[PDB]
């Protein structure tokens, strides 16, 4: 049983890590590299990378605790303790050397810990389309001159009493298409037909409620980073961002910056920010680029 | 039948105002004050005051285009166009003699634009805890090192695909006690009755719906206020605000200070958004003394 369909030559497997299962998906030969979705979303929004990177580099996409067809965390859904189980996952499949690393939104909170404290695992990085947590992030704006801000929703699934999973419970499909799509530039890759795939998966009732506590543990998040940010990141790193309607444009760069000492950034022009989907093309090749860099 | 129940000595009646039906409850005897509330309540905010102000004015408490028992606009929900229907209202009772104005939360949006194009009109003016529309909203941030933000609805209810209707329907109590809680220091006041008669209202359709309509017009507001700004407001003015969690603190008297020569403000230490009911009596005895100046 699988909510995404696999692509062609990939296997869908899962992994006990620390007493929580972790559902991935896997396929290619070569280093490692590991590819960490974000909210809204699982695995399969990297499907149409995986192939292309297949062919240099050994390719894990897990789901994130919760999320997905991965059990919810044991220990806790701030930062530090999520990317103890994705830092795990990769080193079981690369134990005696570095591996490389994409994250997108999400993602990016759950595996910046494990980065700074395992640098050297880490060969090269990406990062995409959303801010680390850091007291930045109390910056946005609640509203904005245009309407709806990027982040309100920061707030509301944070609310106590349970606020966000009981107003969206039952309509779970409703509201993903709206926050993506309000989130999107181009839009019109987002058919019925996909975001149907994407709502099944969220509205299993312990994933909406994970989806949730990610934002719940944000302010842990932010206080965690605090302190592990003192030591800037040493490996190359790059980050994307979109420059059209819901996108981070030039922050995610300027935030980066104060994190890395090697890093590269790049806007893409009509471009929201779901990356891999508006704008496979120009992600893809970026990505593709920048890793084969490296070992491959 | 009526939503909320009247106090003695007020009678709940309606008047058609360009083509719309407006309720409102009215008694006393006087000079008229009008009393504007916010958004998640109708004229039942003011229940308190009014028996008390209705010792030395004439008060009308109108429910806001299609809140409470009031029809919805016909022309829109952006300031200008709320408070044309608000100034009639008024001027009906009140077409011999200049008005007194008190307003609370949304209630603001929708009078300020009359105020400013009317000040002949306007008597002495009482704004609580609440922005006026003009760009320091935009300033609010978007959540806390400690939880949600004073305003992220701002962005929820103008968001479109009715987000905020789809989503809350079915949930209206539960969604107004969070809402309330969240914006108040003194959750003991608000009853679990209470709750339920303001939820009821809200709850009905068309209402539910124009209390987010509100906010769908509040950046057309924002650019209406832009011109209007252009002309200080000349009348007394008080502002109070919340000094406790869910108040505006120390904004609100900040920001009329931009708009008013000549304001002065309270905030009030252990309230929160919901004044009238947080903190009724002491509220109501700077209100009663600021108006019965004049």
Redesign the interface.
């Given at each position: 049983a699988e909510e995404f369909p696999v692509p062609n030559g990939f296997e869908s497997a899962y992994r006990e890590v620390d007493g929580v299962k972790l559902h991935y998906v896997k396929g290619g030969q070569g280093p490692l590299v590991m590819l960490v979705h974000g909210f809204g979303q699982t695995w399969y929004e990297w499907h149409q990378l995986m192939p292309e990177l297949a062919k240099r580099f050994t390719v894990i996409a897990p789901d994130l605790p919760g999320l997905g067809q991965s059990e919810p965390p044991k220990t806790g859904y701030s930062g530090e303790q999520v990317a103890v189980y994705l830092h795990k996952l990769a080193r079981q499949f690369s134990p005696d050397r570095p591996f490389d690393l994409v994250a997108h939104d999400i993602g990016i909170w759950n595996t910046y810990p494990m980065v700074v404290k395992n640098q050297a695992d880490i060969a090269r990085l990406v990062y995409m389309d959303a801010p680390i947590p850091d007291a930045r992030?109390?910056?946005?704006?609640?509203?904005?001159?245009?309407?709806?801000?990027?982040?309100?929703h920061?707030?509301?699934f944070?609310?106590?009493?349970r606020?966000a999973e009981?107003?969206?419970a039952g309509?779970e499909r409703?509201?993903l298409?709206?926050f993506i799509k309000?989130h999107a530039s181009n839009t019109e890759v987002f058919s019925e037909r996909l975001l149907d795939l994407y709502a099944r998966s969220y509205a299993k009732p312990h994933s909406l409620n994970a989806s949730f506590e990610y934002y719940r543990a944000?302010?842990e998040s932010?206080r965690q980073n605090a302190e592990l940010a003192k030591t800037r990141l040493q490996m190359p790193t790059m980050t994307l961002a979109g420059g059209g309607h819901g996108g981070m444009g030039t922050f995610q760069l300027e935030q980066m910056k104060a994190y890395a000492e090697d890093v590269e950034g790049h806007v893409l022009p009509g471009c929201g920010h779901w990356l891999p989907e508006e704008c496979a093309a120009p992600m893809n090749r970026l990505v593709i680029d920048f890793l084969s860099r490296g070992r491959h």
């Open positions: 992030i109390y910056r946005f704006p609640a509203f904005t001159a245009q309407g709806e801000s990027l982040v309100w920061f707030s509301f944070a609310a106590d009493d606020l009981t107003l969206i309509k409703f509201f298409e709206h309000s944000l302010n932010v």
